[PDB]
Every structure is written in C-alpha cells, then in structure tokens.
Amino acid sequence: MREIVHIQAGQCGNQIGAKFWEVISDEHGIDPTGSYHGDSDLQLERINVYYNEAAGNKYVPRAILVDLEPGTMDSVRSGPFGQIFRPDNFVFGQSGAGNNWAKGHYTEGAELVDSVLDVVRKESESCDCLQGFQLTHSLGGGTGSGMGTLLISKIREEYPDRIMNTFSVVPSPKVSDTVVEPYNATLSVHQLVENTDETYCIDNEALYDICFRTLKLTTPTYGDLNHLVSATMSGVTTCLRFPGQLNADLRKLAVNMVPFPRLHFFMPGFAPLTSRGSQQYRALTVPELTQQMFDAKNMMAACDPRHGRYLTVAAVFRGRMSMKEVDEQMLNVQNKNSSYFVEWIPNNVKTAVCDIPPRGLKMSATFIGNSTAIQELFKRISEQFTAMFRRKAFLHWYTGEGMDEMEFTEAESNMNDLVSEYQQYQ
Amino acid sequence: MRECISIHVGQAGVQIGNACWELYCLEHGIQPDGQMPDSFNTFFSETGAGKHVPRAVFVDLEPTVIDEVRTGTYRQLFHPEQLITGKEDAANNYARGHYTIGKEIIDLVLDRIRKLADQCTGLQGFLVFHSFGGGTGSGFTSLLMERLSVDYGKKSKLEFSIYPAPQVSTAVVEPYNSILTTHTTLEHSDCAFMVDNEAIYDICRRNLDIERPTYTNLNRLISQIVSSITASLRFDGALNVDLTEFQTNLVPYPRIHFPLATYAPVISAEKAYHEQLSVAEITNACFEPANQMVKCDPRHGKYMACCLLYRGDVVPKDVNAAIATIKTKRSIQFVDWCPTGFKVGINYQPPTVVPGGDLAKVQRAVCMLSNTTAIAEAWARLDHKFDLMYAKRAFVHWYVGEGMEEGEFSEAREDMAALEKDYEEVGV
Amino acid sequence: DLAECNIKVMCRFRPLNESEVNRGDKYIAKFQGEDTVVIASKPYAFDRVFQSSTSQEQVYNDCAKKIVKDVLEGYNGTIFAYGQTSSGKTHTMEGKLHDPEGMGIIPRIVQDIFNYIYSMDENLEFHIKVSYFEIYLDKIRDLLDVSKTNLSVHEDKNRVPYVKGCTERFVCSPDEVMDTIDEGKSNRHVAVTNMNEHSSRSHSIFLINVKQENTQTEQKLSGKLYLVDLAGSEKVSKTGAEGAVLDEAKNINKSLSALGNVISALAEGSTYVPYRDSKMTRILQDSLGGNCRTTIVICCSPSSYNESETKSTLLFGQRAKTIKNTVCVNVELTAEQWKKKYEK
Amino acid sequence: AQIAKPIRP
Amino acid sequence: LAECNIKVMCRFRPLNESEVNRGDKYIAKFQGEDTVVIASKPYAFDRVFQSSTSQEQVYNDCAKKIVKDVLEGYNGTIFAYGQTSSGKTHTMEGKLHDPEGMGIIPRIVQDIFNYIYSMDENLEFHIKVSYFEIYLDKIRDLLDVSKTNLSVHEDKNRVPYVKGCTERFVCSPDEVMDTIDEGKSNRHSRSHSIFLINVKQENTQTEQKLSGKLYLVDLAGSEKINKSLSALGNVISALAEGSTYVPYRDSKMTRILQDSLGGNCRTTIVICCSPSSYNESETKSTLLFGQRAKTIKNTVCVNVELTAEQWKKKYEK
Numbered sequence A: 001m002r003e004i005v006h007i008q009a010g011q012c013g014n015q016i017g018a019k020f021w022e023v024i025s026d027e028h029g030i031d032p033t034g035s036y037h038g039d040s041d042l043q044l045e046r047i048n049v050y051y052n053e054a055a056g057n058k059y060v061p062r063a064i065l066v067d068l069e070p071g072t073m074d075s076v077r078s079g080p081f082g083q084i085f086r087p088d089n090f091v092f093g094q095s096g097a098g099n100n101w102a103k104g105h106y107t108e109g110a111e112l113v114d115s116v117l118d119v120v121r122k123e124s125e126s127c128d129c130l131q132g133f134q135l136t137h138s139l140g141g142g143t144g145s146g147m148g149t150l151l152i153s154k155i156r157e158e159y160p161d162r163i164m165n166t167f168s169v170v171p172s173p174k175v176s177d178t179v180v181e182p183y184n185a186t187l188s189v190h191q192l193v194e195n196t197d198e199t200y201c202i203d204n205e206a207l208y209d210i211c212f213r214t215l216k217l218t219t220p221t222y223g224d225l226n227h228l229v230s231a232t233m234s235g236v237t238t239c240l241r242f243p244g245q246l247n248a249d250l251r252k253l254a255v256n257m258v259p260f261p262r263l264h265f266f267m268p269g270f271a272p273l274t275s276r277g278s279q280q281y282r283a284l285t286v287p288e289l290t291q292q293m294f295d296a297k298n299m300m301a302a303c304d305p306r307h308g309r310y311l312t313v314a315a316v317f318r319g320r321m322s323m324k325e326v327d328e329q330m331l332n333v334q335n336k337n338s339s340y341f342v343e344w345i346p347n348n349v350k351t352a353v354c355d356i357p358p359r360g361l362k363m364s365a366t367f368i369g370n371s372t373a374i375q376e377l378f379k380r381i382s383e384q385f386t387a388m389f390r391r392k393a394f395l396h397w398y399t400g401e402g403m404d405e406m407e408f409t410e411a412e413s414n415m416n417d418l419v420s421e422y423q424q425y426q
Numbered sequence B: 001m002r003e004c005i006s007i008h009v010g011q012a013g014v015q016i017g018n019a020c021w022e023l024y025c026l027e028h029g030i031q032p033d034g035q036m037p038d039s040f041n042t043f044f045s046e047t048g049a050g051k052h053v054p055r056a057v058f059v060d061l062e063p064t065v066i067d068e069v070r071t072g073t074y075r076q077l078f079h080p081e082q083l084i085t086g087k088e089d090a091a092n093n094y095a096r097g098h099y100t101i102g103k104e105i106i107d108l109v110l111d112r113i114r115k116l117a118d119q120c121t122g123l124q125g126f127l128v129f130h131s132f133g134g135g136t137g138s139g140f141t142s143l144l145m146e147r148l149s150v151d152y153g154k155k156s157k158l159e160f161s162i163y164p165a166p167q168v169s170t171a172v173v174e175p176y177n178s179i180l181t182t183h184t185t186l187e188h189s190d191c192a193f194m195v196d197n198e199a200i201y202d203i204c205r206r207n208l209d210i211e212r213p214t215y216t217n218l219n220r221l222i223s224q225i226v227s228s229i230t231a232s233l234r235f236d237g238a239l240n241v242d243l244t245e246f247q248t249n250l251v252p253y254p255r256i257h258f259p260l261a262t263y264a265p266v267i268s269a270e271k272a273y274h275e276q277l278s279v280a281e282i283t284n285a286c287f288e289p290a291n292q293m294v295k296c297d298p299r300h301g302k303y304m305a306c307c308l309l310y311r312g313d314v315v316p317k318d319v320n321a322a323i324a325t326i327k328t329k330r331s332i333q334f335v336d337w338c339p340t341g342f343k344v345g346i347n348y349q350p351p352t353v354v355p356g357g358d359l360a361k362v363q364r365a366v367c368m369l370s371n372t373t374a375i376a377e378a379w380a381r382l383d384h385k386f387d388l389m390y391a392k393r394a395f396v397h398w399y400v401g402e403g404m405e406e407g408e409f410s411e412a413r414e415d416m417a418a419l420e421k422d423y424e425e426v427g428v
Numbered sequence C: 001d002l003a004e005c006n007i008k009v010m011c012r013f014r015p016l017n018e019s020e021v022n023r024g025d026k027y028i029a030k031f032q033g034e035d036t037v038v039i040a041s042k043p044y045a046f047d048r049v050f051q052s053s054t055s056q057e058q059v060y061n062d063c064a065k066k067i068v069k070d071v072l073e074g075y076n077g078t079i080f081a082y083g084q085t086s087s088g089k090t091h092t093m094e095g096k097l098h099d100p101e102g103m104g105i106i107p108r109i110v111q112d113i114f115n116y117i118y119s120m121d122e123n124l125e126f127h128i129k130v131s132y133f134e135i136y137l138d139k140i141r142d143l144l145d146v147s148k149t150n151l152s153v154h155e156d157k158n159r160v161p162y163v164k165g166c167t168e169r170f171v172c173s174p175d176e177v178m179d180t181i182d183e184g185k186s187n188r189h190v191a192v193t194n195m196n197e198h199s200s201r202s203h204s205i206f207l208i209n210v211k212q213e214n215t216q217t218e219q220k221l222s223g224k225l226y227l228v229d230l231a232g233s234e235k236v237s238k239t240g241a242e243g244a245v246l247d248e249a250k251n252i253n254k255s256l257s258a259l260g261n262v263i264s265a266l267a268e269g270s271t272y273v274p275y276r277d278s279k280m281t282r283i284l285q286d287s288l289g290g291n292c293r294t295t296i297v298i299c300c301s302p303s304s305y306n307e308s309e310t311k312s313t314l315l316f317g318q319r320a321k322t323i324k325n326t327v328c329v330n331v332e333l334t335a336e337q338w339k340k341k342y343e344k
Numbered sequence D: 001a002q003i004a005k006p007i008r009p
Numbered sequence E: 001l002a003e004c005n006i007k008v009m010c011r012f013r014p015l016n017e018s019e020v021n022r023g024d025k026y027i028a029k030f031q032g033e034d035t036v037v038i039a040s041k042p043y044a045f046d047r048v049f050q051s052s053t054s055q056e057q058v059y060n061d062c063a064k065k066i067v068k069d070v071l072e073g074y075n076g077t078i079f080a081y082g083q084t085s086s087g088k089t090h091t092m093e094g095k096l097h098d099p100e101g102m103g104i105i106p107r108i109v110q111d112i113f114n115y116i117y118s119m120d121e122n123l124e125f126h127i128k129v130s131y132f133e134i135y136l137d138k139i140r141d142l143l144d145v146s147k148t149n150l151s152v153h154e155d156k157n158r159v160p161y162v163k164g165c166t167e168r169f170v171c172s173p174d175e176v177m178d179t180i181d182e183g184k185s186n187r188h189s190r191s192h193s194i195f196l197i198n199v200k201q202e203n204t205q206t207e208q209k210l211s212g213k214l215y216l217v218d219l220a221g222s223e224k225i226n227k228s229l230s231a232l233g234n235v236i237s238a239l240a241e242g243s244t245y246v247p248y249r250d251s252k253m254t255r256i257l258q259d260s261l262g263g264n265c266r267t268t269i270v271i272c273c274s275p276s277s278y279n280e281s282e283t284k285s286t287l288l289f290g291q292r293a294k295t296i297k298n299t300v301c302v303n304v305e306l307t308a309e310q311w312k313k314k315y316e317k
C-alpha cells in the first residue's frame, strides 16, 4: 500500500541509490541476503512500501537500475548490498553517453528506454496502490540527465496522476566536473520543470561544506555525500512507512510546499549532524534540531537562503517529541526571521512527526525548503550557457546526435522564465 | 434507550476517539477486550454473551492510524467492519476528501451508520469528531454531513472540530480547507463545538504545569469535555439534559450554532490539595478568559446562551449562588434579548481519572458551553489569512485540479462574510 | 510604429432553456443602454452586451466583421468564447454549420474572408492554410488526423509559440474549409452532462494563416487568425460527473484557472505574467499580450440558478478589457528587396 | 485576386 | 554553356475529299524518314511524318522532351506554320475531350501532371496557366472578353511578356482541361493563340526555386493584308542570314516569342503540307520555311532563382 518505484540513472544515481538501499534495509532490518533480522514489528508493518516479497521470506527491492555503461552496474552488483536487487532489473547498454545529453536522450537512451519502461510497468502492475516514482540522477552528465529526463517524460505520460519526486544532483558553482555541464543542466531542467511534481536539488559543494564544517571530516569521499543524501531521502518518506502523531505523504508535502506549479525545486537538509567527539557535548532537543535545520550552513544546495525569501518549509520530525514544542519552535523561527519568509503566505512551515527515529538516534529531522534563492543556481547555469552558446562551443557533439539550436534556445527561455517567476515572488 | 453514534473522521478525530473510548470503557467498567467483570446502552451494544461493541465508526483515508487502532490495546473492542480505511490520503486537499477520494468509501460509511442506526431504538443524535484544516476532516466530513442530513435530517448532529489556531498552525493550506468546510457544513450541523490546540496548550502549561504537552493530553481533555456533555444520558442526577435540550438552549438563531466548550477544574495532583474546589470557584474559573478552549477573549463580545453541566457532588443551591454571582459581575456581558441565559445540569457521577493521566481525582467538575459573539474575531483572522493567500491565488491549482470550480472559493468567502455580518447584527 | 489596442470583450446572454424554465428560475439580467448589463444592482460595462434575442448575424457583424479585414490587411486576429457549462460558446463560435441563419462565427468568417479575397486587387496572390486541433486532458490532439495523439508547443526566433506537427491543409474554396470543420467536429470529444446534453470537453482551436504576396511591389504580408471554443467551468453538484467526465472536468477547470490567472496578471500589470502554466495559455500568449487584435465573446446565463457563475464570468470579462496589446503589421521582407539591399 | 494551392506529389 | 538547335519537323496530312473529287494527285513522295522529296528537289528536315501517322507518335517524337525540360528548368515552345487547312489545329489541339486524338495540349498537361505526381515528394509546385490570343496586331485576353488591345511591358530581364492577363492557378488535370475548353470556346482562323503555363518548382530542402515556361502557341495562315507573318518571315530571314538589327519589334506576334526565336528557350517547330497537285505554288513556300528555320542556334541556361533566405545570406557577406 502506497508503494514507490525507485529508478537509478547514471553513475551518480546508481551510487547514491546503493547507499539509499543499504540505509533503508538497515532501517527495516533486512540483511544483505534478503532475509529479515529486525527487532520490531513496525519494520515489517510497511515493508511493502519499498520492497516486494518472495518465496522463503526474502524481500526484493522494487528498484530499477539503468545506465548506458555496465561498469557501475557491476560495481553495484559486487557491493555488499548488491545481491538484494533483482537480477532482471539491471537494464544496461554497452555504449555510454559520453557526457552527451543528446546521446543519452535521442540516440542511445531511446534504444534502452523501451526495456526500462517494461521493467517499470511490470513493477508498477505488481503494486497494490501506487503512490509515486523516485529517481536519482545527476544533471551534469550524459546518461543521468538525458536518460532520466526521457524516462520521466515517458512515465509522466503513462501515469499522469502519480507523484514523480526526483533527487537530482545539480552542478556546483565553483568546481565543474565536466566541461559540458551548462548544456546538459539546462536541457535537463527544461523537462524537469514540466514533468515533475517535486525535485530536490543537491550539489556536491554544499555536501563538502557540511562534511568539513559540521561533521569535521578530514577526507570526505563520495560515500559520505551519498550517505547524507540517503538520510534525507529516507526521511522524506518516513510517514509512509512508520506510525506517527501527524502523518504527511508525498502528495501532502507537494500540496503544502508547491504554491505555483513550476516552483517545485527544493533545498533539502538534515539534522542532527555532529562530529564524533562532540556528541557528548550537544543537547538533543527540538530547539537545537530546529536551529540546525534552519541554518544556511546545513542546506545541501549552494544557494544561500538569506539572499532570498522562503515560500514554504516542511519539517518532518522523527522520534518522540511534544507537538507543542515543535509548533512553538516553528512559530518563533518564523517570527524571528520574518524578513526571510513570504508575507502573503501565513504559516510557511509544515510539520510532520513520525514516532520512530533512526537507529541510534533519539531524534531526527528532514528540512525541505522552497526558497526564491534557488534562482541563483539557475541564473549562473544560464550565464554559463549563454557564454558557451554565443560562440557555439562544444555544440557539434550535441547537434551530431540529432538536436537543434532551437531546442537550446527554448531551454534557455524556459530557464529564464523560471528565474523570472522566482524573482517575482521576492 | 437513549443511544448515540460516534463518527471519527481523520487523524485528529480518530485520536480523540481513542481517548474518548478509553474514557468511556473506564467509566462503565468495561475491559478493553469487551468483557465486563446498565447505563452503558448509550455508547455500547450488548452481544449474546459478554462482548460489548461500541457504537463508533472510525473512518480515515489514511490507513496508518486505524491500523494502530487495529493492532493497539483496543483491538478486540471495535467491530472490524466499523474501522474503515482507504488507500491514499486527502493530502490536505478539500477536493480530494470531498469529490475524488471521498466518493469511494462514502457508501461504506453510510451503510455502517445505517446498520448501527437499525440496532438502536431511541437514537438521539450523532457525535461527529473531526478537525478543520485537514483534507479528510474538511472534505469527507462535509460529504458525510450532507448524506446524513439528506437521509436522517430530523435527527440531531453534533460536531467537535479542531479549529485552526491564530498563530500556531501545521498546514499551509489550512485557511482554504477551513473556510470551505465551514461554508459547506454551516447548513447541516446543529451545534458545532470548536476547540483549538493553542488554547489547550496554554491550559496545560498554566494549570497542569506541563511544559511539553502532546496530542495525547489534548485528546484526554477533549474526551473529558465530551464525557461531561454526554454524562446526562448515561447516569442519573438532578436536572438531566438531552442533546435536543442543548440545541434548544444554545442556538438562538438557526445560523448561530458555534459554541465554545470550557472545562473546570483542570488541575494537577500537587494542586489538587491546597484548593477547596468549591462550586463557586469552579464556575468563576470556568468563566475566566484564560480558561477558554478557543483562543478568543469573551470580554470582546456578549454571551448569548450559556449551559452549565455540573458533575459529582453538586447541590443546586450552590449552583444558584454561583450563577447569581456571575450575573452580578460587570466584566461578563450578556446580550439584552436574553434575560435568562443560564441552563444548569447536575449529575451524580464524578469525573473518572484515566491511569497515567495528568488530571487529578476531583469530586465535582463543570463543562461550560457558551454561545458568545467573541468567536467572530477567529472567523475574521481566518478570513484575513484566506484573503491574503487568495489574492495571489496560491495553491488554488491543487484544489481546482481535483474537481473544484474557482468560484467555490469566492462563494465560501461570501458565506463567511455573511456569517460575520450575522454575528455582528445579533450582537447589537 | 506602435498602435496599442485593448481587448474587445463583448457579452452574449442566451435564453432560458427547458431544463431551467420548468424549474422556478427567474431572468435576473437587467439591460440598460447598449453596452452595459446590471446584475444584482451592480453595473458592468463592456463594448457590446447582446440581449437574449440576438441572432447569429448580429453578433457576427458586431464582433467578427472587423477581424476579417484586419487579418487580410496584415494584422493577427483571435476570438475565443468563455463562460460556464451550457452558456453559449459552441453556439456562438460554430453552431449549425450548414444552416444559413443558425451558423456561427467560424463559417461566417471563412465566407467573408473568401469574398474579401475575391474583391481584392488583381496583383495579389493568397495562400490559405487551415489547422484544427484540441486540448484534451492536457494533450494537444489533431482533429484532422487521429495518429497525432499528442503534440508540443515550441517557440520561434522572435519568441512566439506555435503548435508543431499539426496538419496544415491548404484551401481554395469555402467548401473545403467547411469539410475541414465537419471532419474536425466529428472527432471532437463530447459528453452528456446534466447541464448540457452535448457538452464539449475540449478546447478546440481553429487556425487559418493568410499569406499575401503582391507581384508588382513584391511586398508580402502574413496574418494569423485564431478561433478558439473553450470549455466551461463546471461544478460537480450541477454537472453530476462520475468517471471519465470527472477527469475531463478536472482538466478543464485547471486550464480555465490558468487562463484566469494570466488574464489577472495582464490586468494588474504584473511582471512574470504566467503564460507557461498551461498549454492553452501558451498557445494564446501572443493573443492575450502580444501582436494580436483579440476579442473575447463571453457567454452568460440569465438565470438565478447561475448567478455566481455569471458574476465570475462578468468579472473575468471586465478585467480582460483593461489589458493592452501591441499590434504591428507583419511585413515579411521580400527576396527582390533583400537582393537590392545587398547590392546597395 | 487568386488563391494558390501547392501541388505536392 | 550549351547550344541546342531549334528543331524543325515536317508533317503531312491525308488528301482531302475535295481534292480527290477535283482530281488532285499525290505529288510529294516519302524517301527515308529524315526528308521528303517533292518536285524532284530534296528537302532535308529533322523528321518527316507520313500522311497516316498517329498523333501520339508526333507527341512522343516532339513534346515529351519539352515536358521534362519545362519540369526541371527549361523554357519550351512548340508551334505550327503552314497553309490554311494544312492541319495546324489537329496538330496542336486535335480533340479536346476525345481520348483518341488528344493532339498536343491535353496530352501534355496530363503528362506534366503525371510527372508531378511522380518523383520526389519534397517539392512544392505552383503551376499557373494563361491563355490569350492576338489579332490584327491587337493583344486580347481569351479568358475574359473585357480585356482588349493590351500591351507588352519589360520584366527584370530583357524578355517581353504580356502584362495584365489573368493567370489562373490549376491543381488538377480536370481544371486545366476545363480552362482549355473555355478558352477554345471563347474563340470564333486568322488569330494567333498563345498558351503559357508557368510551372514553378521550389525545393524546400535545398531552398532552390526553378521556373519554367512552355509556350504552346499556334500561328495563322501564310497565303501570300497579313503583316505579322511577313515580319515572322523577316525575323527568320534575319536569323537565317545572321544579320543583326533583327526586326523583333515590327509585329506584336514576334514580341512574345522573342526568347523562343533565339533566346534562353529550347523550341521545336512543326510544318504541315499537302500532297495535292493543285497547290504546287503554296506548298513549296512552307517547305523552304522549315529548311531555313533549322539554321538558328540558341543558347539555353537553367532558369534558377535564389529564395528569400538566400538573398539575405548573401547580404551578410
């Protein structure tokens, strides 16, 4: 009941989804072989949300792993939680996109999207009451951006009345991993804006900042960043899986947090986030959790919320806590930061409390923020796109796979319109 | 026999219902399994041997909380067909609760009510428990009230809603849902008792001296209020009061049926001693603005009708003295067209204390249900929030996209302006 | 080079119907003057308020007669009807296609455009192309080809949106246009509702492009004419929709709310002006805030059973009348003049 | 004036 | 470039019943297929048709090349010169609505429509017809009797053309057939009929437009007051002798076929003669006409124009 189909597209999506599934299985007491070794019945009460059943009390996740190269699929299979997945769900080609959005959306992704949609359709049909779709990808690459966008469009045209929440990794401002990030990101957002219900924007720069500042990690690796992302991915849908005093589904979050249809780009966050050797000094309470949540340092997007105003905020608390404490803390946060909140919306914050915390934590929280500050990311992406596109730089690679300059202009216009809409409500 | 049906819609309704049914089972000496080791026919049904089946219908589109009821300590108390669940929630959408997702279990709940209504000889009314603001507790309750009014109509209908608070709030689309539901259900309910979480939080902080009140405590307080309301049916006493008496003594005009409940004494065990808790003190503290369960000062308005439901060791002479002292006081303001705005009800059953509860064992308690014009300011602030959100037309696409014309918002706003105007007119 | 024009919003009141005259309903509309209507003692001023007895010829003459001349002169024109369920949009726009007295705006426009073409200067050569599609469940369907189940709205060099892939049929005689209209109407989606027995569940769009070339002066002009028949706002209590009709109603209401939002944005002088929230608002972007001379024919019911909807439609028409358009002649540069400019 | 229809095979 | 000869073909009709009643004999004799011998004097032509030859034969031998060349880029012209009642209506028009005859014009329009139906689909064709005739050096529109005594202006290139005549677009072979029938009905034969179709082939992919004009014209009698034929005999005498200062402007008949006579247009000429013996004098005059007409050589270039986008691009450089 209220099942979620999970899709991993590209290297970033796959290596984040693997951490996500390890985290979820640990939370629900599933050992890597697929057996159940938990301690509480609430783990099995709603195991149908993220898992299917099989003969022998073995639980298989309903995850669909897609890529245009088999290397990352082999890495996932060879991992510690790799044999939990269904061997039929691995759908892959043999020619990668090569960080070409056109290659992954028009030429190589088209040949694989049929089989991917077949697996998606089978998994959805096996579900009792489908709730939504979950996608992990990166906007800065070829297979992720392009293939995930094509799959999102196809699924949206196939299931128009279902939530499509995508956890995308946006290009970082200061350091660029690929030289064609602006093109891929603009072309991916041009379809994310139209074919998604709520997209969560994560950039590696904010993750590195969190790790070095709050977590005090000397050598942050991709595992730690994927782990921080998996924390908020699990925390977003905790009310679907465990009982709580005040429950909020994905659609409830979308209704509260999306005032206008095209403004569905969110900044996620997590709390508590302390360093070993500093937990004995902290005080785990709702005020401290809220102070951590609303801090600009704790955001996982490189868009400072101070340079903007919040439209809607969601606070999905976990554990045993007073509703009075939570509501008073939210009210005082809104009052003390009135300049950072929108005035034509009373009570910008939404609250959901789940009465089951993550293992080893007495309390936890996930912060979802719809801020006008996300326009800065789009503005810099559009600036880089214009700089690269006035001079036709790196453009024959995209044109050689069947794209046109008019598509680039339309994507840029859509990005500019989204920026203008965000600026209007500020 | 005098029998009532309880309907709990949405998460708030079902939580309050869990508290209320724990309280009732404690009052009547029924173990949670349904085995008693009269005066229970109002809320319970007797089977061939032992098992007492409560007259409740738990309805929610979310299956989670009804599943908690199904697996909780009160598992073998309710008839499993009474507990009704959906698949997907209303997601804080009035349209989902009313038009789209509501019209998939409405036939089931109506059939269950009819089956319960066929097992009662002297049906008296409905005790619908829901919450303003939520999608289910605003959309599904409106559809259910329409169906019940069309089907039964002559039978009474009482509501115990959770009104949105001024400052403390949870949802962001709460004003829309609240105005839509109180536009739709203004013509169907006969007496809608309203409470808000913020006033109960303040009551818990000051009187009960608990700095971290949660939903369980609020549900217990509301359960005590509803037990005080319905105690006249269950137990004996001097000046017993029925639900039709509530309607005929609390509703002056057909469009003015929004009283606010108040309870006294709400004290801890430490302060249970050191206090006399006399009838006069209880009544005076019950008329205090800080003890109101709705965030509105009654001093900014005039009382129309006020019914007092005393419990426990209460003598009518004490009640008369307390009423005289209240009437002589100048701060309380009664309207001109009501020379006598006091109805008194005395009962011999003292309030019961749930084990592991904040309330203390007291010999007497009161429940003040007053129809005052001070509730107009709550409507005013809710309408202000609605107007602010609707000027920019925010969140409207979610409601419009599930079977709701854009003009329904304007119609609801006009109806609310009319209700505010009616309250102002009756004030003068 | 700029000649600003407003929206020529005009109101049409249909007579009370059988289902409404036999159930205790009263004619609430009171008409004063020739351009204003009084409802609930609240004046509303429009360009022309047509009363219950107005024939199709009169509304066509006072609404769409100028649009043919404007299109053939070089400007862009667009007319779209608005209202609630069972209000008079299909009757005003198309009506009975083959009846000389009951035909609507579209057949009269096409006949007049052909007659004006015949009465033009001899040196002109005209190319006319007809497109006819609909918006059903947020999908652009071609009513002339069922294979095009859904289409897309792209943009041009000068940032104007247009439907891509729609069948463009060249025409020579009004008979061909009438056959196109008939074939399109056969495939348009209709449903049975309590308010209207032949209710339309799609936003039909009729497009004709008139390309005009002069042989002597080589000067070339183009004109785009949109004729849209929108669906009406519905209420589940009145319509009683269950099943597919409910989904159609949901999509129709969402699209109409988007259109109302864009009209309010134009009227208030906002900056974002949300054209991109729906397909219909995208297609009519240049119509509402660009290079088009647009007239809105709002249709209303005069009964007390539909007073709230009539007031909402009246407010929509009043707000639209204030918004302004920037209209210029579409003079496409010529090849001979291009080569002359190159040489000189 | 005249109206032209392209003859596309 | 390329130099192509103005073809000349000789056609013979069967002896008439009046001639066999009057006792006329068969003087002309056929020798081979590329000449005809009469009066013991060989006359060399490109091709000589027998008396009983079929009209499909002459169409296949003469006109099909004109059809394909006008379809691609090449202006064409075919006309008949001969004595009265020698057969220059059946040669050109024949039977308008009898499938057996379909002399030249109906067959050529059907063939051009078939060829249009064939070949690449990515091509836009705008074909325009315009039928007009002249009489006594007065140009008169044939599709509308209102127009009378028109004139000839000058286009961008040095090519005189009729100005003001109605040019009706046609889309189907039935339309061309009915417009030809109406034009012939509007004719009451000393008049010169000029039939022009302007097939304009525009390619969307290459943005290249090619305009072709075929002239299916018919002459008047040559019994020799007639003046246009005298200048027609003067212009060919200018062309055959090669003398400059050619009198193209002497008569208005030659002012329309100026590119057909020596310009950017590949043309063929047919002559009709009679084997009768009573008309020995007038028969030799038409025979010598075809021999001299072969002496002309014309230069043809593909009529190619650049689209509006192409001129814009050349301005950028």
Ligand SMILES: CC(=O)O[C@H]1C(=O)[C@@]2(C)[C@H]([C@H](OC(=O)c3ccccc3)[C@]3(O)C[C@H](OC(=O)[C@H](O)[C@@H](NC(=O)c4ccccc4)c4ccccc4)C(C)=C1C3(C)C)[C@]1(OC(C)=O)CO[C@@H]1C[C@@H]2O
Pocket (backbone or CB within 6 Å): A022, A023, A024, A026, A027, A224, A227, A228, A230, A231, A234, A235, A272, A273, A274, A275, A276, A279, A358, A359, A360, A361
């Ligand atoms: C002795 C003790 O209490 O140890 C704690 C601990 O010290 C702290 C510092 C933990 C620790 O976390 C980290 O150091 C960390 C490393 C990489 C990325 C993110 C965090 C901990 O490792 C993490 C671990 O978290 C869990 O057990 C949660 O269930 C968590 N699990 C995982 O992330 C996970 C890790 C490996 C394998 C499988 C799952 C979780 C959180 C949300 C949703 C699902 C699961 C906890 C409480 C601790 C340690 C062990 C030191 C903290 O993290 C979490 C996620 O709880 C860091 O700040 C918190 C506060 C904790 O007190």
Ligand SMILES: Nc1nc2c(ncn2[C@@H]2O[C@H](COP(=O)(O)OP(=O)(O)OP(=O)(O)O)[C@@H](O)[C@H]2O)c(=O)[nH]1
Pocket (backbone or CB within 6 Å): A245, A246, A247, A252, B009, B010, B011, B012, B013, B015, B016, B061, B062, B089, B090, B091, B092, B093, B131, B132, B133, B134, B135, B136, B137, B138, B162, B164, B170, B171, B197, B215, B218, B219
């Ligand atoms: N007193 C009390 N109020 C509650 C409780 N739970 C939620 N509320 C209030 O109810 C409102 C939220 O509505 P809910 O009843 O949870 O929503 P719902 O009716 O279940 O509708 P959906 O969940 O959207 O299907 C908020 O104002 C909460 O403060 C509760 O247990 N007790």
Ligand SMILES: Nc1ncnc2c1ncn2[C@@H]1O[C@H](COP(=O)(O)OP(=O)(O)NP(=O)(O)O)[C@@H](O)[C@H]1O
Pocket (backbone or CB within 6 Å): C013, C014, C015, C083, C084, C085, C086, C087, C088, C089, C090, C091, C092, C196, C198, C199, C200, C201, C230, C231, C232
């Ligand atoms: N001016 C009019 N005179 C007479 N009958 C009319 C007139 N306008 C509408 N009607 C009648 O009303 C019915 C049509 O409703 P119509 O006018 O078709 O509604 P509509 O606007 O197309 N409804 P909808 O598609 O839901 O927006 C027809 O059968 C008409 O005969």
Ligand SMILES: Nc1ncnc2c1ncn2[C@@H]1O[C@H](COP(=O)(O)OP(=O)(O)NP(=O)(O)O)[C@@H](O)[C@H]1O
Pocket (backbone or CB within 6 Å): E012, E013, E014, E051, E082, E083, E084, E085, E086, E087, E088, E089, E090, E091, E189, E220, E221, E272
């Ligand atoms: N090849 C032929 N076969 C049969 N009949 C023919 C042939 N050629 C000509 N005729 C007939 O002979 C006559 C001459 O025809 P026509 O073609 O009318 O002559 P013309 O040379 O056009 N005369 P004119 O226009 O007066 O200078 C007509 O009756 C024709 O039908």
Ligand SMILES: Nc1nc2c(ncn2[C@@H]2O[C@H](COP(=O)(O)OP(=O)(O)O)[C@@H](O)[C@H]2O)c(=O)[nH]1
Pocket (backbone or CB within 6 Å): A009, A010, A011, A012, A013, A015, A016, A097, A098, A099, A138, A140, A141, A142, A143, A144, A145, A169, A171, A177, A178, A204, A222, A225, A226
């Ligand atoms: N957190 C994380 N980020 C990654 C990982 N792999 C790649 N990225 C980021 O993703 C972007 C590159 O896109 P990628 O997914 O590799 O291209 P694709 O395989 O064509 O989709 C860059 O910004 C990388 O830093 C990973 O394993 N973990």
Ligand SMILES: [Mg+2]
Pocket (backbone or CB within 6 Å): A247, B010, B011, B062, B089, B136
């Ligand atoms: Mg709920």
Ligand SMILES: [Mg+2]
Pocket (backbone or CB within 6 Å): C089, C090, C198, C199, C200
């Ligand atoms: Mg219609």
Ligand SMILES: [Mg+2]
Pocket (backbone or CB within 6 Å): E085, E088, E089, E189
């Ligand atoms: Mg002749």
